[PDB]
Design a protein around this ligand. Sequence first.
Ligand code: DAO
Ligand code: DAO
Ligand code: FE
Ligand code: FE
Ligand code: FE
Ligand code: FE
Lengths: 239, 252
Amino acid sequence: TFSRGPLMEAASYPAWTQQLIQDCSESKRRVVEHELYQRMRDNKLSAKVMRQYLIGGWPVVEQFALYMAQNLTKTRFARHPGEDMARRWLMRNIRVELNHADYWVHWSRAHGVTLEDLQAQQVPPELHALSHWCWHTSSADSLIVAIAATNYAIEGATGEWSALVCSNGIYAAAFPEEDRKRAMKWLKMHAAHPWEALEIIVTLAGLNPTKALQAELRQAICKSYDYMYLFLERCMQQE
Amino acid sequence: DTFSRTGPLMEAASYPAWTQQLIQDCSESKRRVVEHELYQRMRDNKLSAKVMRQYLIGGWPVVEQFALYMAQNLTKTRFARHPGEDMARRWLMRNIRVELNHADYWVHWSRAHGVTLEDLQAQQVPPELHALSHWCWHTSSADSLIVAIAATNYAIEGATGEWSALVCSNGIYAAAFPEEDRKRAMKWLKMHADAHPWEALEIIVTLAGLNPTKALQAELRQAICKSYDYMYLFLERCMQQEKTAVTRERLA
Ligand SMILES: CCCCCCCCCCCC(=O)O
Ligand SMILES: CCCCCCCCCCCC(=O)O
Ligand SMILES: [Fe+3]
Ligand SMILES: [Fe+3]
Ligand SMILES: [Fe+3]
Ligand SMILES: [Fe+3]
């Protein structure tokens, strides 16, 4: 049984957890420090690649609350404290995504990418792998693995690359004054969820999870990062 | 707009123009899979131990779960709702049985290259190799019956009939196995090296009819090419490791 130090510090969680974070650090790093985001931050990304990024990312954003809904259907009342924690967290964070799909549409519109463009999904297959993995793990994997792959890995990495993109103001400064707030909304809203997810994962796993379970979590987390990396590499192949 | 085949099952000309157009539109995506360099090298017994291991481990999930994709699609059918749905139900109920022993045959093929059942289950391969399996589960789970059959039973089985035939086409790969191990090792390849892809196409055409919307045709084309393209992604990644493995020994 595990009960938690501060929320957003690896120290507050067990030894196997800090080792897990450590084992996933490089897979995460090459995503959150990727050249594509550095160039987006500096208003240096070509329009063609920015268009691909917004289109290719749309399925994961549009369906993100649906991944959580699928995971919610794996929960049962009072079957395990972590499960209750997950149920309550999922029931609240599905609400949180209420407008986020709309914000992505507005962001995309600011770059000339229409709703028709988002729906058409005319992008390379490297960009869709992330969405297929999210649906599969949300559909077929255990509650703990699916939360690790989607809510911990993707949301955590997304908090970091969204912050990087906004870090020096150049990107936002490129938008016309009267379009900036609406265009930057999604980035702003995403630039604590990942640590809350980890807390749920740790509670579910316990203080002494088997090596097999630690390995399953590590591999699921790194697969999410690696499909984000595959996405970004293919985008930059064009640049 | 009902479809009823009159020409031979395994000829494109027996199907409507839109179907022949679909085949044409997907032909280059198919070709670069079924003619891939990796299969020419496998045919000639050239592939490195590293890549053979990656190939056999990476392909396992799609093979192991193939009848489960078909099972999931069967749950989408209802009796007498559409002639193509009855055709799909009866075909799926028959061919789920066909896969009875194929996972075992893949295990036997893998073991002939030193890949253990434990190696298959551990799934220690690059993510480019797992994309295909994630796509297969997603389309089988969430797409329409017609799209999911196109993505799995038409695209993947069709391509697999042709690359397995290519690997077996000149006898070198098989003769390289020792006498006492060859039959068991070659079983999976021989069982797949075929009416299945054409039967799947006939079902797709029956479901779609003679004048499907352009939107449905585009959905089929994109699903079929996605299956081919994920096979291509798989093979490209393998050949990257092949070039590294062979170059290392050449320079050494
Ligand atoms: C690494 C590039 C991936 C493309 C961007 C996908 C962003 C998905 C963000 C999901 C989390 C959320 O929408 O709240
Ligand atoms: C490049 C393809 C990667 C290996 C995939 C294995 C082939 C899947 C075969 C599915 C059909 C069947 O098992 O009968
Ligand atoms: Fe969001
Ligand atoms: Fe979030
Ligand atoms: Fe088979
Ligand atoms: Fe078959």
